[PDB]
Structure formats: structure tokens, C-alpha cells
Design a protein around this ligand. Structure first.
Ligand SMILES: *[C@@H]1O[C@H](CO)[C@@H](O[C@@H]2O[C@H](CO)[C@@H](O)[C@H](O)[C@H]2NC(C)=O)[C@H](O)[C@H]1NC(C)=O
Ligand SMILES: *[C@@H]1O[C@H](CO)[C@@H](O)[C@H](O)[C@H]1NC(C)=O
Ligand SMILES: *[C@@H]1O[C@H](CO)[C@@H](O)[C@H](O)[C@H]1NC(C)=O
Ligand SMILES: *[C@@H]1O[C@H](CO)[C@@H](O)[C@H](O)[C@H]1NC(C)=O
Lengths: 348, 443
């Protein structure tokens, strides 16, 4: 889709003029080939000397490490859009990455808010071979310590794999694994039978978007948005950053990147808060978006992902407000009726 | 250089699949050409793994380019903790222990010398944070607290504020970890503040000892250095031997040989990394090598160096599980032949008292600042201590009053019988104390 993306950016995106920068819509998709991509990037930086070009990728994550390293070498900001190949990369070196992804911490936070709202206390934290997921486990433990989130514990863990996963049960499950490794887990779960309507699986991490009947994954808001909106958002971010740096002497070029570290200066000091397309689009030092907009996609029997709940400004609005948890959808759940009698039942 | 690489590759081939060999790489001042050079090398050579040993003063470009296509590489020089995590660098492996191991040995050394106290002077860089986290985890596993963990500021001067904070603390022991410039700056301030000597013991890493020893290292430090650090700079023979064994161990496919246009990743790359971890190169060259955790091997002995006689000396080595000190006596900063106590008594306790009528009366002082002295029922001086506390709940800022009563009388007796030096101080807000819940954090 690289050729299609370039065509969709040259024709449509060029005519787009969101909004100061001398030439806003100046850019070029320029086709995977790290050597050619870096060489072309240096050529444009030396000649164009633009204040940054929005990058769009379609591959489902090695591109991000190279892009940030190139940005640090060039000492120029390069925003990442079109989620995919730009998933977090929490560690950073001085550089200005400004990626538009969603970190695991917020994804875990939104999921727990949904779980508490739906009265889904029981949960597990099954995980495959550790791709450096120690942070994810720690965050869950921190969130668990509270008033009601506490529930049954779990662990991290082919017939042996199926037995280990089925030895904790607890209905609700939390999964964190790569696509290449998650597939064997799904097959093992399917063989164990924990993939029907009797269980709900929350898959978080870089998955993005035999699948179990109940699947809930949290992804960044506007994931289904067209690439035209993505490029427009990236252009707006660059324009907002230029305006933010306009509060002082705005004629501060990067000297022409570095083609023929040394500067040791980032750009997050000035570019900290911007507002565009409503939502919460503000970048942090680590490169995330503080208080980002998130949605909770759900998988139905039609193999379709639909928005169930939206998170924005620490507000959780979700359709399908099932008051009852359907706890015994797999007994131990009783629907107890009653009536108000002051000596016996007092309701306030 | 090329000659050493050819010798190492030739030895690896003779050690004993199809024309197995490695091609050396030439570093460049700018990483842009470095990435291009490695990309051409990988496309042509298509070698399973790449060895990086550039002594710049950069391993980032090689590891970052190895990340694409999932081609694991081995680094032999860099020891920065940023490479320890495989989430960012999933194609980077090395044998030298990380700087977090320095924290592990420090804890072992601290436990050896019957020390339970520390003032962790750690730099604010990522390496410093990782060392603090590793040390804190080890201390937590032993139910031990670090006391003060006051941070630092890389590339900053006039850091006497942190030194003043550490000096007032009871414990007199500092485990310092920072860069050469930071170590020199802290050492100069410590020397000018009478902090290097008396009952102070310094523990520093390899970088701190070398840089500090160059500029301003006092003759009381206790640094740590790798047993074969210099050899590790030229021990590529072990790397080639381990890599050859890993390939000989193992349904595999040839790594991609095309760099100009490629998106597919190596399917067996993760498998090669998994087999490499399982590999146990027990040949014994430069010590036993065994990969630990992910990306590093925790099988290297650590030596201890001291600045006695204005020269680095060996005072023992680390066996891998327990230190083995058998060299000459350690010359501490004060010059004493015995290890100075790591903890200092603090006979200046500050006492908090709450206004209770039967026990602790509270009365305002007179104009001169000392409240009137009365006599007991049977006739005797009443012991009153000048206490400081809020006036109303009015200055409302530490109005000096005088306290007396049951508890204060008991306190005076305790101080006399055990040598206190008390300075009473009433509670800021009148309240005995209870566990309140704030922001979902009861404690
Ligand atoms: C190992 O074998 C490879 C070929 O498989 C050699 O690579 C060639 O090296 C020459 C000289 O540098 C180049 O001109 C060729 O273009 C290389 N071809 C490939 C396929 O990479 C390599 O030189 C050999 N190295 C040793 C140490 O014998
Ligand atoms: C380390 O010791 C080994 C012993 O085999 C030696 O070959 C190597 O050259 C030494 N290190 C250096 C770089 O001098
Ligand atoms: C040295 O460490 C090894 C690690 O396996 C241990 O088996 C051995 O007993 C230790 N010896 C001493 C003296 O610490
Ligand atoms: C307690 O003993 C020490 C040591 O002799 C002495 O200096 C001190 O004055 C004594 N009591 C106090 C704290 O007054």
C-alpha cells in the first residue's frame, strides 16, 4: 500500500491547506527501503529545509526505532501518524519524536474503568513469553490496589499452554502478546474451550486492529478515520508547534539537519500543549499524548469492530449500558428481588 | 581493524555452514554513513549476526538497523543500561554485564561488611535510574530501605545542596554512580566540604573511579572494575566461538540478503535468539560465559580497586556469588586500618507533642521569651521545655511556647538516662493521627 499511500498524499493532501509556515502543504510520501528512505530524507532536509514532514506507515514496528534515530541525527521533529509501525516506543534518547500512538498505561486505565463500570471484578493477567511486559504487570498491580478493583490473581504463561491458561479460569481475561505469539495462544484457548460466550478476553498492547466470542480491545480514537484526516492532523500539529515556537524569535532553523548529539537540544520545551479537532492532542516529554482520546472496540459474530465506549478528558461514555453483568453467562449468580420496607430494607 | 577481524574469523572457521565467515565493518563519524555501510554489508554478506566493538569515546546505529528484519547482533563494548531492555532493542545481545550488576555487587559487598545503611547518590540519566531501580529491588527483597535516594543533575554545577542534605543524615555511606564529568564535580565539592574522610566510605563504578581518579579522586575511594574489561575490548574470539556454536546447534531459513527494498522480517530470527540464549559456551576463555535474562550475560567476575598510595590497587575479586577479599588491607579515606562505621549516631532527636491537659500543658511564654517558673504542690521547681508550635491552628507560624507535664517530665528523665538532646515541637495540626484515604491511596 506504499504506492497507494503516496498517490493519496500527492494528489489529495497537496491541495489540503489547514492554515506562520511559508509553505504548509509542501511534502512528499517518497515510497520500505531504509537506505533509500534515509538518503531521500537527507536530500529533502538539505534542500527543502522544512520544519518537519508528517510520516505515515501501513506496516503492522521496526520502522519507529530507525525514524527516531534519524530524527535525532537530523535534530528535526517528525510526527508519526497512521497508527502502525509507530506504537509507543516508550524509551527515548535528546530528540523530538512526537508520535501519535497510545501507550499501554492509558489503555490499561481505560480498560479498568470499563471493568469497574460493568461490575467485572474477576480477572486474570495471562501473558505469553515476556516481550518486556514487566511494566504492564506492574501497572496492573498499581491499579489493582484500591477500593474494589481487587480480584483473583493470575500469572504469565500446545497442550501444556492450554492447561496453564485453563487452570485459573476467572472468566474475564487480560492478554498481552504479539500477533505471531498470540495466535498459538488463541488456538490453545480454542482447544481448551475458553473462547465462547462464557468468557470475555481483553487484548491490549500492540495488537491494534479462532477469535473468542467476547473480545474487547482499546485503540486510539479515530482509528477508522481516513488517511486524509490523519495527514491533516499531522500538518495541524506541525503548524501549532510552529505557532507555539512563535512566542519568541521564530527564525531558528536546524542548520540543515546533519548530513555532512552535537546540538544535544530537544524541542519539547516550547511544543507542549496544542488544540485542534477538539479532542485532547497534547504531547508529553516521552512522546505520548497526555490525556489522549481512546475508544473500546468490540468484536461481534460478524467479525466487525464497533465502538462501545469512548474515553476523553477523563470521561467514560459508553453505549450499551448493561446494568447487570450477566455474571453466569458461562451457578453462582442469583437475581434477587426485593422491596423497600424501612425496618428491613432501607434505600438511600 | 581488518587484520584482527580476519584472524578471528579464520580461527573461528578452523575451530569447527557453507563458507561460514564474517566481514568486518568500518565506523564513520556520522551514523548516516554507518547505517548505509551496514545496510550494504548485510545485503552482500547476509551474515547471521554482526559484531560491534567500536570504541567511539557508537553502537546505536548498528543495533537500530539490526532491529529491522529482526537480525540479532552482538555488542562487545557498550555497557549502557539502555540496551538491557529488549522492548526497544530486540535484536541486541552482549556478554559483558550491565551497570545494574554493579548495584548487585554493591549490595553483596554492603551485606559482607555488616552494613545496613546507604546514601544513594545517583545521577539523573537513564543509567543512573536503572541502577537505583536494581539496587532498590535487591534491598526490598531483603526488607532493607535505602534511606535517602536523592537524585542528581547531569551536566550541572554547584551541587552542594545535595551534599548538605546527605551530610545531615545519620548514615555515612554513599554509593555514587554517574559520568566522568559528574563524578569529578561531586568529588571536588566533597573535598571542599570535608566529606571525603573521617567515617565516610565511597563506593563508585568503573566509570566514576576512572574519571575521578584522572581529575580529583581522593585517596579514600573504593571503585569497581571488570576483571577483563580491556580484554573484553579484544575478546571477539569468544563471540565468534559462541555464534558458531549457536548456528551449529540448529528447520531454518537463510536470513534475507536484500537491503534495497524489503519489508519481510526473518521468521527464524526469534528462533535464533532463543537458541542463542539456551547456548552455554562453557569453553572457559576469559571466564565462563552464560547469557542471563535478556541481552546480557551475568557470568563475569568483578574486581575491586582502591586509591591507596595515590594508585589503583586490587583488594579482592568477585567469585560470582560472594566477594573474595584477600589482598592488602583497604586504606579508607581516614587512613584507619579498620573499616569505618557506616552509621553515625544522632543524639539530637526532635520530639512531637500534642496538647493534652493532664499530660502536656501548653502555656505562652513571657515577654523575655521564657515563661514563668512555678512550684509544685509540695514545693519544687517545675520542669518546662521551650516548645515551638502553631499559635491558633495570630501569627499561625511557630510561636515559641513552653510545655510541661507528665509526658514532658518523662521525656526529661529519658534524655538524662541515655544522653539525648531534645528540641520539643508541637504537631502542626492538632490531631492524634489516623489513616485517611486520598486519591485511592489509603497509606
Ligand atoms: C566470506 O564470504 C563472503 C561471500 O559469501 C565474502 O563476501 C564477499 O567479499 C568480497 C570482498 O569484500 C566482496 O567483494 C563481495 O562482494 C562479497 N560478497 C558477498 C556475498 O558478501 C566475504 O568477503 C568472506 N569473508 C571472509 C572473511 O572470508
Ligand atoms: C586479555 O587477555 C587475553 C588472554 O588470552 C589476551 O589475549 C588479550 O589480548 C587481553 N586483552 C587485551 C586487549 O590486552
Ligand atoms: C562462586 O559462584 C558460584 C556460582 O555458581 C558458586 O557455585 C560458588 O560456590 C561460588 N564460590 C564462592 C567462594 O563464592
Ligand atoms: C552522653 O555521652 C556523651 C559521650 O560521653 C556525652 O558527650 C554527652 O554529653 C552525654 N549526654 C548528653 C547527650 O548530654
Amino acid at each position: 500500500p506504499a504506492y497507494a499511500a503516496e498517490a493519496a498524499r500527492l494528489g489529495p493532501a497537496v491541495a489540503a491547506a489547514v492554515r506562520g509556515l511559508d509553505v504548509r502543504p509542501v511534502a512528499l510520501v517518497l515510497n520500505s527501503d531504509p537506505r533509500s528512505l534515509v538518503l531521500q530524507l537527507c536530500d529533502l532536509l538539505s534542500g527543502l529545509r522544512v520544519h518537519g514532514v508528517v510520516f505515515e506507515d501501513d506496516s503492522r514496528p521496526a520502522v519507529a526505532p530507525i525514524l527516531d534515530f534519524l530524527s535525532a541525527q537530523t535534530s528535526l521533529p517528525i510526527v508519526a501518524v497512521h497508527g502502525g509501525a509507530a506504537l509507543v516506543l516508550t524509551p527515548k534518547e535528546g530528540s523530538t519524536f512526537l508520535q501519535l500512538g497510545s501507550s499501554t498505561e492509558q489503555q490499561l486505565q481505560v480498560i479498568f474503568e470499563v471493568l469497574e463500570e460493568y461490575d467485572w471484578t474477576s480477572f486474570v493477567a495471562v501473558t505469553t513469553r515476556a516481550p518486556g511486559h514487566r511494566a504492564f504487570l506492574s501497572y496492573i498491580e498499581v491499579l489493582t490496589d484500591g477500593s474494589l478493583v481487587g480480584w483473583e490473581h493470575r500469572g504469565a504463561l500446545e497442550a501444556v499452554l492450554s492447561a496453564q491458561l485453563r487452570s485459573v479460569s476467572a472468566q474475564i481475561r487480560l492478554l498481552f502478546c504479539a500477533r505471531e505469539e498470540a495466535e498459538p495462544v488463541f488456538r490453545a484457548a480454542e482447544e481448551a474451550g475458553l473462547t465462547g460466550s462464557g468468557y470475555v478476553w481483553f487484548m491490549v498492547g500492540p495488537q491494534l486492529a479462532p477469535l473468542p466470542a467476547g473480545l474487547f480491545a482499546v485503540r486510539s480514537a479515530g482509528w477508522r478515520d481516513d488517511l486524509a484526516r490523519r495527514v491533516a492532523a499531522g500538518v495541524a500539529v506541525v503548524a501549532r508547534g510552529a505557532q507555539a515556537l512563535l512566542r519568541d524569535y521564530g527564525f531558528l532553523p536546524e542548520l540543515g539537519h546533519d548530513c555532512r548529539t552535537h546540538r544535544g537540544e530537544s524541542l519539547h520545551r516550547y511544543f507542549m500543549n496544542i488544540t485542534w479537532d477538539n479532542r485532547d492532542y497534547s504531547f508529553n516529554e516521552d512522546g505520548f499524548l497526555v490525556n489522549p482520546s481512546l475508544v473500546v472496540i468490540s468484536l461481534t459474530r460478524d467479525r466487525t469492530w464497533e465502538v462501545v465506549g469512548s474515553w476523553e478528558q477523563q470521561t467514560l461514555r459508553l453505549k450499551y449500558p448493561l446494568w447487570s453483568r450477566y455474571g453466569r453467562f458461562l451457578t453462582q449468580h442469583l437475581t434477587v428481588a426485593t422491596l423497600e420496607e424501612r425496618p428491613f430494607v432501607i434505600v438511600e | 581493524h581488518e587484520q584482527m577481524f580476519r584472524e578471528a574469523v579464520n580461527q573461528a572457521n578452523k575451530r569447527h555452514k557453507i563458507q561460514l565467515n564474517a566481514t568486518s565493518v568500518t565506523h564513520k563519524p556520522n551514523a548516516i554513513q554507518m547505517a548505509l555501510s551496514v545496510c550494504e554489508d548485510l545485503i552482500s554478506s547476509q551474515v547471521y549476526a554482526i559484531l560491534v566493538s567500536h570504541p567511539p569515546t557508537t553502537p546505536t546505529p548498528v543495533s537500530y538497523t539490526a532491529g529491522f528484519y529482526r537480525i540479532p547482533v552482538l555488542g562487545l563494548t557498550t555497557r549502557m543500561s539502555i540496551y538491557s531492555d529488549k522492548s526497544i532493542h530486540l535484536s541486541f545481545l552482549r556478554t559483558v554485564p550491565p551497570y545494574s550488576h554493579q548495584s548487585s555487587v554493591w549490595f553483596e559487598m554492603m551485606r559482607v561488611y555488616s552494613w545496613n545503611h546507604i546514601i544513594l547518590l545517583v545521577s539523573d540519566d537513564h543509567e543512573g535510574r536503572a541502577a537505583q531501580k536494581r539496587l532498590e529491588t535487591l534491598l526490598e527483597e531483603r526488607e532493607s530501605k535505602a534511606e535517602k535516594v536523592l537524585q542528581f543533575d547531569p551536566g550541572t554545577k554547584n551541587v552542594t545542596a545535595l551534599l548538605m542534605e546527605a551530610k545531615e543524615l545519620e548514615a555515612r555511606v554513599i554509593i555514587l554512580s554517574a559520568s566522568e564529568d559528574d563524578a569529578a564535580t561531586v568529588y571536588r565539592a566533597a573535598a571542599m566540604l570535608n566529606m571525603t574522610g573521617s567515617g565516610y566510605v565511597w563506593l563508585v563504578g568503573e566509570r566514576e573511579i576512572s574519571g575521578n581518579a584522572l581529575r580529583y579522586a581522593p585517596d579514600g575511594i573504593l571503585g569497581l572494575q571488570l576483571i577483563n574489561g580491556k580484554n573484553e575490548s579484544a575478546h571477539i574470539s569468544d563471540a565468534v566461538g559462541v555464534v558458531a556454536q549457536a548456528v551449529h546447534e540448529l528447520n531454518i531459513t537463510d536470513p534475507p540478503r536484500g537491503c534495497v527494498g524489503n519489508t519481510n522480517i526473518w521468521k527464524t530470527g526469534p528462533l535464533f535468539k532463543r537458541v542463542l540464549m539456551s547456548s552455554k559456551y562453557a569453553d572457559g576463555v576469559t571466564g565462563r560465559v552464560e547469557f542471563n535474562e535478556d541481552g546480557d550475560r551475568k557470568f563475569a567476575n568483578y574486581s575491586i580497586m582502591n586509591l591507596q598510595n595515590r594508585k589503583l590497587v586490587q583488594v579482592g575479586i568477585y567469585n560470582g556469588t560472594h566477594v573474595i577479599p584477600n589482598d592488602r588491607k583497604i586504606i579508607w579515606p581516614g587512613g584507619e586500618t579498620e573499616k569505618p562505621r557506616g552509621y553515625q549516631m544522632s543524639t539530637r532527636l526532635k520530639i512531637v507533642t500534642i496538647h493534652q491537659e493532664p499530660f502536656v500543658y501548653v502555656k505562652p511564654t513571657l515577654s523575655d521569651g521564657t515563661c514563668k517558673e512555678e512550684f509544685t504542690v509540695n514545693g519544687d521547681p517545675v520542669k518546662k521545655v521551650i516548645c515551638t508550635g502553631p499559635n491558633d491552628t495570630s501569627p499561625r507560624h511557630t510561636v515559641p511556647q513552653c510545655c510541661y507535664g507528665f509526658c514532658i517530665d518523662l521525656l526529661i528523665k529519658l534524655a538524662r538516662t541515655m544522653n539525648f538532646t531534645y528540641e520539643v515541637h508541637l504537631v502542626a495540626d492538632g490531631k492524634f493521627g489516623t489513616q485517611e484515604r486520598v486519591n485511592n491511596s489509603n497509606k
